[PDB]
Amino acid sequence: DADKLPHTKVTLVAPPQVHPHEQASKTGPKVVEFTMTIEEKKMVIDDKGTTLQAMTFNGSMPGPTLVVHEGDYVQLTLVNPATNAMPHNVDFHGATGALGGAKLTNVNPGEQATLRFKADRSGTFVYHCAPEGMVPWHVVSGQSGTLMVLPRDGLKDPEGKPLHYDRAYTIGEFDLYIPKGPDGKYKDYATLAESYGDTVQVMRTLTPSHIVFNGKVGALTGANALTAKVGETVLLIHSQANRDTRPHLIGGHGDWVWETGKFANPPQRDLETWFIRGGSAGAALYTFKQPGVYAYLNHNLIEAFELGAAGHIKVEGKWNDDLMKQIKAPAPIPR
Amino acid sequence: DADKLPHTKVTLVAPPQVHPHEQASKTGPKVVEFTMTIEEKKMVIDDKGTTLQAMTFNGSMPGPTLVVHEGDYVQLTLVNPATNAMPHNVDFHGATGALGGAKLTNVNPGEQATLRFKADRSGTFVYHCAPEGMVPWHVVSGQSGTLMVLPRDGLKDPEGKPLHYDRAYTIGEFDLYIPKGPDGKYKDYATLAESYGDTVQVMRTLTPSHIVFNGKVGALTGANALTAKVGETVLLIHSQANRDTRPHLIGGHGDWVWETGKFANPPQRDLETWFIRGGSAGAALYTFKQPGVYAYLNHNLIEAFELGAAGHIKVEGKWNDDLMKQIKAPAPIPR
């Protein structure tokens, strides 16, 4: 009975970071309390100045990642400020009943609600907005993120041996549907409501104009690249709430991967490229063995390099000649 | 030797039901006899009056599900009435040899044939029409269904423990390619043959005009919703003979899922969203824990809510506050 358990309050952090948490814990079940605020905002998504009339949890794409342990209860307060124009709600794939909670969290601007559910299954799970009659629009405009439920004794390999990560990163991939005018340029809209009709027409073609990680082309590059060091194990959480994608680390691998994202199932090893089904989140572990700049991308290479689905990981440390060596540098063909 | 075994005759039923059968059985191998009749018919597929010049097994999309046990022989009589215009046949993915039987069942209007094959591998398997030179057209126009071959001792979890279902439902998902005229409206054709040329042009774009469950937008809603009750375990068989899809139950899960559809392999647990490869059938078990109306859909949400790939399950019983509770209903933000 959840009424009788201790409560803990957690402060969320912005992607691509994930808020501090324990992996294996000796703690018993808790009611874990979070709050999020919906924000409607126009946002620039590329190098040409194109805008998206966007909708978000907490002002970011994706929304922040929430972490609990199997057997905890999630208790979320969802706030829809009066500065917004539209109604919203939340559907947690990690929850059981009432359309994942959507039926119990319908909030008009100026309102809030509080939901509790038991996190009784381990894995990474998508959450997203789902207002009746308007579901695909709110999701492709930016309203999704991840709930991670860790097993109480931490992650395990197929033989039951312990696995860990030293840091976690959260990547949300967004297929966008931006309309064009008769001059062939992308349209800019003064309000969210004015974008709707034209956007639905693009959506129905099933062809995205852009596909981006974390809100914009190049979001995870330059000063905002992911970082690690040789010897460190990273967890890469990848969510796609609407469309299939195929993650790959250039010069690396997926050492242990749950591509369907559910930790009670055995992971697969040595993957070159994995698969995240539209409407889910998956998770991969990698231990860095070489320093350098890696690319992390969707391996439909058109989707990555032409449409925006790619980022960088900068890795410090010492180069290893045993794994890889330039025997002869580029030079003229001998004659 | 099959000539020496007992014969049983089975009467088929229309989707979404599946004909009565035993799961675990003490019976030895039988020759199991079925018959099906091809029907060409024009059909209304949406709320706007759009028509499809369709082709079916037994007058339904999908065709009926045939159920046997591993080691049985399937013996099918396939009838092509003289009221039809085109030749037809059948390819069983569950069979070995002769293009799945297609080579041995070529029937012109006014003709019939009888095929027998050994069902020597467990799982759910697609069957579909495949006449030489005309294969994709006959499949996307509606000619596919499922053969389920159960292991003789019933379904099993990864550790070999017994699994059961209390009822089975069969869902066939159909990507449709309906042409449009110069006024932008969908075309209506007087004959099946007249639809061919325009339809192939649409097919080659790889973009469906509609994606429907069981023959029409909203087929599995209102009076025709699926039903269950709290405590009941349902088997959801999902077939897609031509295109990938990603099933999801809103407010539920896949407790045990064979997404590739082959029962001798261990299932996965706790899935939010699973994946059915174009040209296959898969199967999921879920035990209901909460009452209410669930949605069952393709989680490319555009494909579901804009193009038609979604249905309803109405579930009776008692609400459970431990799994999910509204702590505070929607109300004004405190000030």
Place this chain on the structure above:
Amino acid sequence: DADKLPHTKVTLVAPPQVHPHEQASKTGPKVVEFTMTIEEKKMVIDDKGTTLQAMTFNGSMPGPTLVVHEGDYVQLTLVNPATNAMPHNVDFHGATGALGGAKLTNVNPGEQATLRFKADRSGTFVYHCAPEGMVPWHVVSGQSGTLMVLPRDGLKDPEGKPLHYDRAYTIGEFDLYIPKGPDGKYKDYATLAESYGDTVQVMRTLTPSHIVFNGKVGALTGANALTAKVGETVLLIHSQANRDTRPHLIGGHGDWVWETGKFANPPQRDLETWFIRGGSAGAALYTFKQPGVYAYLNHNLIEAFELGAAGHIKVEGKWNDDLMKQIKAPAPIPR
């Protein structure tokens, strides 16, 4: 330390064959030496005379398959002749570091380079060209193939029992993006460089004009069909460096399949249709039980029969009435 190991030189062969090799071996680790030469060439890809301005390893699509054992080192000499116009390199998904080797093999026309890497993970892995700023174009124009790394003690089933093949075939599937002129006919270009701008526009639609096995529509049919005999076990290696596909053998199955292509993971059995993620290679074993002509195809049937993704396997031997029998041939419906 690789400097101290014996070296072996291997001569490559053209697809769909794979060069001779041992499965289980008693040999210890070797440095295995290969060479490949890039070739830019215009090529006819269909029955209508359409051309592709292509780029290849060794003059073929796909490039040849390279085979080693886990713990061997791959040492490749990559040559870019002065008759070519563009720079090239190589990224091995089987390697660790420096963008899979791409950073260490940048060769302008007139130049060559030599790379060594440790093949420390078993499976089938894609290799492809990846020059900075030009990656998707070089890949969809034909520059990809497979590295197979076999476990030293051969392939194994989920219980650790031994598995073998009697012959191996290598199939590379290529999504092509051929532009059209205002008359609706495919364009023919005098140089590789002149095709670039128009081709990128087609690529961005995500809709291929053609999808072919091994370089052309019908490449693996007639005199060039694959062959086997009843009782023989074949390994079918399938690579797709850019786009998802779903292989199927008509009248057959995948007896044991690694659809993600990594041999240290247990295979699945009895598959009707499997799934190769864009940016990977997978592998299937089948033992023929019936003679005849089988089709091997992508089971999006539009992609197979309309766009080109299909081939033939001709199988000799004795027909087996137990698996399949025509009980009654096509004849008039009794009255």
